[PDB]
Amino acid sequence: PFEIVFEGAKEFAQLIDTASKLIDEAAFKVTEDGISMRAMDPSRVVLIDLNLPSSIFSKYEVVEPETIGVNLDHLKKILKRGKAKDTLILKKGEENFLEITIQGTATRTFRVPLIDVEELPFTAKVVVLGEVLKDAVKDASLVSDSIKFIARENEFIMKAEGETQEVEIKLTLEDEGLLDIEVQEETKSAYGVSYLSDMVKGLGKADEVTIKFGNEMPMQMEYYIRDEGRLTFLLAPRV
Amino acid sequence: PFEIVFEGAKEFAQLIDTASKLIDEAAFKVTEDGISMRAMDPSRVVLIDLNLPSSIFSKYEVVEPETIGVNLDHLKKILKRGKAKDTLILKKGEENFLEITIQGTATRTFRVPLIDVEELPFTAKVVVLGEVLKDAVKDASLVSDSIKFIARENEFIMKAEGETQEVEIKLTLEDEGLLDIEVQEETKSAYGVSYLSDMVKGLGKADEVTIKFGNEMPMQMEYYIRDEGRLTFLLAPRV
Amino acid sequence: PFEIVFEGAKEFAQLIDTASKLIDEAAFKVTEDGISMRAMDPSRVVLIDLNLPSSIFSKYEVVEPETIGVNLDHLKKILKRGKAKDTLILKKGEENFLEITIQGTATRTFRVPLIDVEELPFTAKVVVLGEVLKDAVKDASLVSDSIKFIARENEFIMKAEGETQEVEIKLTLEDEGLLDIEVQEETKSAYGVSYLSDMVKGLGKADEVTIKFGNEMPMQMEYYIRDEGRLTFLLAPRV
């Protein structure tokens, strides 16, 4: 069916690690154009959409298109064996088995059984640095389990208050953190910090994150893996 | 009342972290000259005297003098959010609330409720490197809960023995560790290693530590934070 | 009896640390030529043979030959106090006490009581990089408690399978990992991963490891500490 090679096994491990913090089971659609995966977290709050085009792979050969289901927690522990300079080879041919090869000084091939997996009018859009978003969520985690997103004409505010203390992060476009802001009407919404904590991990300091959300509306978070691999989250608002 | 800015949020976090290992509650006197704090550990063995002059702050503006009480364990977790290059802003104006702002790529402002806090003839003086003192205490921690301090005319000895093993550290002025030694009469005293372990943390390898103590007498340990900020411990002798 | 000095206290600590993961009690024979130690793991599966010649020591003076018994777990915690650039001095003279001196900025001398300790036709030989052997064992640890060693005329295979998954590492001399291979007849044998995990720790990426084993036969693993200090393991085959 296919032979797929990814340079930098550790970074691919982190990518799967990030997803594994929200999902445990997922089906990967392997086509001629790339690898796509759409899964949902157990609490049905987060929709994860991962798109890995062939351009981010050193070698991409798919003889026949196929959808495979893997255990991300199982897959993660194997991918963590790879170093930063290691080469990752994803081979599939034994009908119901996935070959995971970590190639560095030597060639180490894992053999994993495949499993059966069952397969918005945003009024505010902002583009923020991954660092700022990461720090803001962690800050909110100290004071509350809930973080509020506020977007005005020329300012973006992330605010969280608890029983005793409070944290607030304001961005006004003239700052380094905020790169772009497109707001139609004043937009307020609150989300679970615990969820945002998991989907914010793996973010680089230079990563550009696009956030779309509305009043009492789910938010869409999107950034790119190696500039071509798209990772999109759809987070439901806090009840 | 005041606006105080400190460059290097992580180092300030470590300073509060060090104190938090001995005290949980403390009152900070904020004057025109600097910030001072005098608190005592729960076991009433250690007296901590911290002095932070305005010279170690990038911006020091105190409109009106005031004494504020904070939870160091609470304060510590917030200050740990700051990086090494981060900017720390301590703002106070809302009568009973302290604003803690971590400023790096973006501006993140915490809001913390203030709490109500209730506010020797040394015969031997030595000046030792922070590294030597740190290593000696940790060495003593392996063999005993008690460490003995011995100071002669031209030698300084830290010795600890347990039930089975023993460690000894001798300094004779001609060594790199000992920089100065002023001893009137032969001086012996023992102290709790657990306490010395906490007050020795955060010490640099180049820090100069001045130790004063006497026979069956409490010891005074003092070194400087950024060459101007004075940190002084008063440790009672072992019973 | 002797005064022995070793430059690089941290590396010596790691050496004792590695052995301590297999043995808890051992007798060290100190002669004019070097220090040797032969002990066995509690489960009587592994024989450890350590040889430390005088050439790896900065100063080696043995007045009288002697065999001393120490607690490696006790010894390890003391040696961990030493840094990479620290100097280690092993002094013995008080008949039943060992002096352990860590010398860096200052001189810290420990005093430890000595204890009383009670003192193959290989058909396949391979020389492999320490990195490859380390990675292979860790890979096998994920899928099974048993790892199989296979050596053919011009290929060396380490294979492990569990209940659901499988890992395989093939080396064919033309690879970077395999440096030499001398095989008489086809050789197969299996060993416990848990044991191999402990004796593979401390291995460098550039270390050359010589492995000798036979059909249903114990394996001999050998590499060198600082090119002169020989460390040899004798691991029994899996039942």
Side-chain angles (χ1 to χ4, degrees), chain A residues 1-84 86-93 95-117 120-152 155-173 175-215 217-239, chain B residues 1-84 86-93 95-117 120-152 155-173 175-215 217-239, chain C residues 1-84 86-93 95-117 120-152 155-173 175-215 217-239:
Chain A
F2 66 84
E3 175 186 351
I4 300 173
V5 188
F6 185 88
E7 301 296 337
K10 184 170 184 176
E11 185 175 356
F12 195 94
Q14 295 172 349
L15 176 58
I16 304 300
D17 177 34
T18 297
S20 66
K21 301 174 188 303
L22 287 177
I23 58 183
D24 311 326
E25 239 181 11
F28 292 81
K29 184 180 182 181
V30 183
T31 59
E32 185 179 318
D33 303 288
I35 310 178
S36 62
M37 181 257 287
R38 203 208 247 186
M40 197 137 189
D41 96 280
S43 58
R44 300 293 179 263
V45 187
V46 190
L47 178 62
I48 299 92
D49 196 322
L50 180 63
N51 196 345
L52 304 181
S54 55
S55 59
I56 70 177
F57 299 101
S58 55
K59 179 179 178 181
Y60 200 88
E61 295 295 308
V62 178
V63 179
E64 298 292 339
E66 189 181 359
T67 298
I68 61 178
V70 308
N71 190 309
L72 268 69
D73 298 272
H74 277 243
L75 172 60
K76 176 181 56 183
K77 300 201 174 188
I78 294 184
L79 296 180
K80 282 179 175 174
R81 296 292 309 111
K83 309 174 190 301
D86 275 337
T87 297
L88 175 65
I89 300 94
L90 300 178
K91 279 184 177 179
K92 167 70 205 304
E95 193 153 0
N96 286 335
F97 274 95
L98 176 63
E99 280 200 350
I100 310 166
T101 294
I102 298 182
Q103 183 177 266
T105 307
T107 296
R108 308 125 63 182
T109 299
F110 288 81
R111 190 169 171 269
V112 169
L114 297 175
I115 62 181
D116 187 32
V117 179
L120 299 176
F122 303 113
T123 59
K125 179 170 74 69
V126 293
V127 181
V128 73
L129 292 178
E131 178 178 45
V132 177
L133 186 61
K134 241 220 278 192
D135 295 334
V137 170
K138 296 178 179 180
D139 290 338
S141 180
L142 265 55
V143 304
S144 174
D145 296 279
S146 176
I147 176 178
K148 190 173 184 178
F149 280 64
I150 303 178
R152 229 97 57 179
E155 63 173 359
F156 174 62
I157 304 179
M158 288 171 289
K159 184 162 53 183
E161 67 172 13
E163 303 292 339
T164 59
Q165 47 195 13
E166 163 198 346
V167 64
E168 186 183 36
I169 307 96
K170 174 183 293 184
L171 296 169
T172 171
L173 186 60
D175 309 332
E176 184 180 0
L178 192 54
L179 305 183
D180 182 34
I181 173 173
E182 305 181 19
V183 172
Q184 312 305 320
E185 72 158 352
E186 180 178 359
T187 299
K188 296 182 179 180
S189 187
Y191 307 93
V193 178
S194 58
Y195 294 100
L196 275 179
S197 177
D198 292 330
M199 59 198 60
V200 88
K201 294 176 184 177
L203 272 186
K205 304 304 192 174
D207 286 333
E208 300 184 13
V209 180
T210 301
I211 298 179
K212 303 181 184 182
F213 66 110
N215 291 310
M217 205 179 303
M219 62 162 287
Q220 176 180 287
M221 170 179 170
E222 179 175 332
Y223 65 96
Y224 282 81
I225 307 299
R226 292 184 169 187
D227 297 324
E228 301 248 346
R230 176 183 53 83
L231 180 56
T232 303
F233 298 99
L234 193 62
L235 175 63
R238 247 304 185 89
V239 182
Chain B
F2 66 84
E3 175 186 351
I4 300 173
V5 188
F6 185 88
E7 301 296 337
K10 184 170 184 176
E11 185 175 356
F12 195 94
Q14 295 172 349
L15 176 58
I16 304 300
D17 177 34
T18 297
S20 66
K21 301 174 188 303
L22 287 177
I23 58 183
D24 311 326
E25 239 181 11
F28 292 81
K29 184 180 182 181
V30 183
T31 59
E32 185 179 318
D33 303 288
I35 310 178
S36 62
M37 181 257 287
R38 203 208 247 186
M40 197 137 189
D41 96 280
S43 58
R44 300 293 179 263
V45 187
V46 190
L47 178 62
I48 299 92
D49 196 322
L50 180 63
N51 196 345
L52 304 181
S54 55
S55 59
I56 70 177
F57 299 101
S58 55
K59 179 179 178 181
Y60 200 88
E61 295 295 308
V62 178
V63 179
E64 298 292 339
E66 189 181 359
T67 298
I68 61 178
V70 308
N71 190 309
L72 268 69
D73 298 272
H74 277 243
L75 172 60
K76 176 181 56 183
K77 300 201 174 188
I78 294 184
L79 296 180
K80 282 179 175 174
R81 296 292 309 111
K83 309 174 190 301
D86 275 337
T87 297
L88 175 65
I89 300 94
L90 300 178
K91 279 184 177 179
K92 167 70 205 304
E95 193 153 0
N96 286 335
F97 274 95
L98 176 63
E99 280 200 350
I100 310 166
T101 294
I102 298 182
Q103 183 177 266
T105 307
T107 296
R108 308 125 63 182
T109 299
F110 288 81
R111 190 169 171 269
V112 169
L114 297 175
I115 62 181
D116 187 32
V117 179
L120 299 176
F122 303 113
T123 59
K125 179 170 74 69
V126 293
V127 181
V128 73
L129 292 178
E131 178 178 45
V132 177
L133 186 61
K134 241 220 278 192
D135 295 334
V137 170
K138 296 178 179 180
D139 290 338
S141 180
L142 265 55
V143 304
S144 174
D145 296 279
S146 176
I147 176 178
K148 190 173 184 178
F149 280 64
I150 303 178
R152 229 97 57 179
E155 63 173 359
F156 174 62
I157 304 179
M158 288 171 289
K159 184 162 53 183
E161 67 172 13
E163 303 291 339
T164 59
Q165 47 195 13
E166 163 198 346
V167 64
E168 186 183 36
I169 307 96
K170 174 183 293 184
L171 296 169
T172 171
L173 186 60
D175 309 332
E176 184 180 0
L178 192 54
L179 305 183
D180 182 34
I181 173 173
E182 305 181 19
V183 172
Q184 312 305 320
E185 72 158 352
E186 180 178 359
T187 299
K188 296 182 179 180
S189 187
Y191 307 93
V193 178
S194 58
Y195 294 100
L196 275 179
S197 177
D198 292 330
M199 59 198 60
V200 88
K201 294 176 184 177
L203 272 186
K205 304 304 192 174
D207 286 333
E208 300 184 13
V209 180
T210 301
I211 298 179
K212 303 181 184 182
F213 66 110
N215 291 310
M217 205 179 303
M219 62 161 287
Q220 176 180 287
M221 170 179 170
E222 179 175 332
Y223 65 96
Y224 282 81
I225 307 299
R226 292 184 169 187
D227 297 324
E228 301 248 346
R230 176 183 53 83
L231 180 56
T232 303
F233 298 99
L234 193 62
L235 175 63
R238 247 304 185 89
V239 182
Chain C
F2 66 84
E3 175 186 351
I4 300 173
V5 188
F6 185 88
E7 301 296 337
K10 184 170 184 176
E11 185 175 356
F12 195 94
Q14 295 172 349
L15 176 58
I16 304 300
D17 177 34
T18 297
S20 66
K21 301 174 188 303
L22 287 177
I23 58 183
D24 311 326
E25 239 181 11
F28 292 81
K29 184 180 182 181
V30 183
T31 59
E32 185 179 318
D33 303 288
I35 310 178
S36 62
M37 181 257 287
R38 203 208 247 186
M40 197 137 189
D41 96 280
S43 58
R44 300 293 179 263
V45 187
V46 190
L47 178 62
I48 299 92
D49 196 322
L50 180 63
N51 196 345
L52 304 181
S54 55
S55 59
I56 70 177
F57 299 101
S58 55
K59 179 179 178 181
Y60 200 88
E61 295 295 308
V62 178
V63 179
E64 298 292 339
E66 189 181 359
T67 298
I68 61 178
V70 308
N71 190 309
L72 268 69
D73 298 272
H74 277 243
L75 172 60
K76 176 181 56 183
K77 300 201 174 188
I78 294 184
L79 296 180
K80 282 179 175 174
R81 296 292 309 111
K83 309 174 190 301
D86 275 337
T87 297
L88 175 65
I89 300 94
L90 300 178
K91 279 184 177 179
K92 167 70 205 304
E95 193 153 0
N96 286 335
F97 274 95
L98 176 63
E99 280 200 350
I100 310 166
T101 294
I102 298 182
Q103 183 177 266
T105 307
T107 296
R108 308 125 63 182
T109 299
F110 288 81
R111 190 169 171 269
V112 169
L114 297 175
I115 62 181
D116 187 32
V117 179
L120 299 176
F122 303 113
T123 59
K125 179 170 74 69
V126 293
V127 181
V128 73
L129 292 178
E131 178 178 45
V132 177
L133 186 61
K134 241 220 278 192
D135 295 334
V137 170
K138 296 178 179 180
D139 290 338
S141 180
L142 265 55
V143 304
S144 174
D145 296 279
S146 176
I147 176 178
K148 190 173 184 178
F149 280 64
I150 303 178
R152 229 97 57 179
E155 63 173 359
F156 174 62
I157 304 179
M158 288 171 289
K159 184 162 53 183
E161 67 172 13
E163 303 291 339
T164 59
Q165 47 195 13
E166 163 198 346
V167 64
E168 186 183 36
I169 307 96
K170 174 183 293 184
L171 296 169
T172 171
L173 186 60
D175 309 332
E176 184 180 0
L178 192 54
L179 305 183
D180 182 34
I181 173 173
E182 305 181 19
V183 172
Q184 312 305 320
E185 72 158 352
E186 180 178 359
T187 299
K188 296 182 179 180
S189 187
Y191 307 93
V193 178
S194 58
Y195 294 100
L196 275 179
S197 177
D198 292 330
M199 59 198 60
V200 88
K201 294 176 184 177
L203 272 186
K205 304 304 192 174
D207 286 333
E208 300 184 13
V209 180
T210 301
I211 298 179
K212 303 181 184 182
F213 66 110
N215 291 310
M217 205 179 303
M219 62 161 287
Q220 176 180 287
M221 170 179 170
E222 179 175 332
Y223 65 96
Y224 282 81
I225 307 299
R226 292 184 169 187
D227 297 324
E228 301 248 346
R230 176 183 53 83
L231 180 56
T232 303
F233 298 99
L234 193 62
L235 175 63
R238 247 304 185 89
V239 182

